[PDB]
Amino acid sequence: ACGLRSFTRQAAVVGGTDADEGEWPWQVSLHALGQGHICGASLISPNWLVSAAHCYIDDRGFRYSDPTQWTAFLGLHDQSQRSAPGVQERRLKRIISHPFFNDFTFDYDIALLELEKPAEYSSMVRPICLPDASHVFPAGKAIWVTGWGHTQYGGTGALILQKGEIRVIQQTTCENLLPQQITPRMMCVGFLSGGVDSCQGDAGGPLSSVEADGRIFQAGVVSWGDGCAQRNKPGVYTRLPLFRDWIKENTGV
Prior knowledge:
12 strands; 6-stranded antiparallel beta barrel; 29% strand; Thrombin, subunit H; mainly beta; 2 domains; 6% helix; hydrolase/inhibitor
């Protein structure tokens, strides 16, 4: 029962960037309290979220690694409507960053978050499917990027959740075009639709990919907020399939 939306009503049925209510029920808004929306994540069970490890590194005097300073908003659609019927608010109980995560190269940039109380599944709150470690997202496959991200010049993000597409491209392309290190845990992508870039994610937000079955699987996790794709350069995102056993061993999922 993972990844099957409810697509309440219709509203947008011919395109657009604004997401519809209930169209991404696994998208989570993470607030470091006193600052509002800071990161994204994805629901995989009543108790566990997937996010990015670099969201939880202490900067300034604020301890982003401290779980007690975080609140997860699930089923949230408009960041000025935190109060709204489907919204669920949960405190964080534990953060499990990946043991091999490197704060400089953002390699192995994935984290597991435990809710203090279970989420309640609804029309607006539903889990996404996790791919097996052998699940392949081939070059050219379209994947959805969603969030409340800033512009690359930052640049307030939109109040209404935004959606856009990217496509998988060859790993060699990002190797020969970007100066940063591209590791096997990262996927190379190009812009597909939107949007003038894929910067609507969110760091720790999910990459949603509609599979042949029709259930939506999470192909990856957003790393750098401005590692987003655009007309002249590709973007890099964190893969998820090679982490499946590690997620399940740590969560039961």
